[PDB]
Amino acid sequence: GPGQTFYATGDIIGDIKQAHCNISEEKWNDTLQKVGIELQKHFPNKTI
C-alpha cells in the first residue's frame, strides 16, 4: 500500500541450528525435591 512496510525474514546466513533453552539439572531437581518436601505435608502418606 501507500507508505506502509511489512518486515519479514529474508535469508539466513550461516548454518541452521536449533532454538532451545538450558537449565541446570542439579539445581532443577533440587528445586523439584524441595517442592516435593513442601507438597507431601498437604497430601500425607502419598507419593507425588
Next chain:
Amino acid sequence: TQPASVSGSPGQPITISCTGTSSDVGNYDLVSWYQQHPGNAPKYMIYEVTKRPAGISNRFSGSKSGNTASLTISGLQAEDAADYYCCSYAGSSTVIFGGGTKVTVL
C-alpha cells in the same frame, strides 16, 4: 595484512604479526596460525587465540592486542624456516587468511 618475511638468529624469539579490521580479529578472537614447508601440506599448532593442540611444544605462543594478533616463536632452529600463514573468521560464516611470512633462520 602480514609482513612478507622475517629473519632471525637461532636461540632467540621472533614475532609475526597480522593486523586486520575490527570485523576480522577485533570482533571475534578466532585466529589460527599454520606453517607450511615447501612441497607439503600446512601444519596445525595454533587454533584459538592462545591455545595449542597436542603434540606441539611451547615453541609457539599466540596473542591478540586490540585489532591485531601476533605469534611469538620463543627461540629458533633450522626447522622453523617454513612459511607461516595466519587465519581468522571474517563474519557471515566466511573465513579469511593472512597471506604469508617467510622465516629466515640464520
Next chain:
Amino acid sequence: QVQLVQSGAEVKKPGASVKVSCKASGYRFTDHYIHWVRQAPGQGPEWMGWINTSSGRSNFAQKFQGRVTMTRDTSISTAYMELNRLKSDDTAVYYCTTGSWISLYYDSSGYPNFDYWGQGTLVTVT
C-alpha cells in the same frame, strides 16, 4: 590415526568442470565440518567454503558463488568438490580440511580450526 585421501591430477582445457573427491578415514563423517583450501603456487592459501556433513548445507566464499558446488555421501563417507568454468588461474593445489565439531545447538561452522589436512591435489589448466 585419521586420514584424508584426495584425488589425482586434473589437466583439462578452460571452460570445463573439475570434481575433487575427499575421503575420510579414522573418524565418522557426521561429526565434523569439511572445509576447502585453494593455494596457488607462489601464493598464500585461500578459503573456499564449508559443508555441514550431517545435513548437506554448504556455504562458499564471497566471490566463488555460481561456480562452486559442494556435495557429499555419508554412506561411503566422502565429499565432492565441483568447480564449473575453470580459467588459467585455477591451476592450484586443493586441500580438504577437517574443521570444528558439528553440534545442533550452536553455529561452529566458521571456526578456523583446521585440524587434519589431506594430501591435496594439483589442478593444472592448460
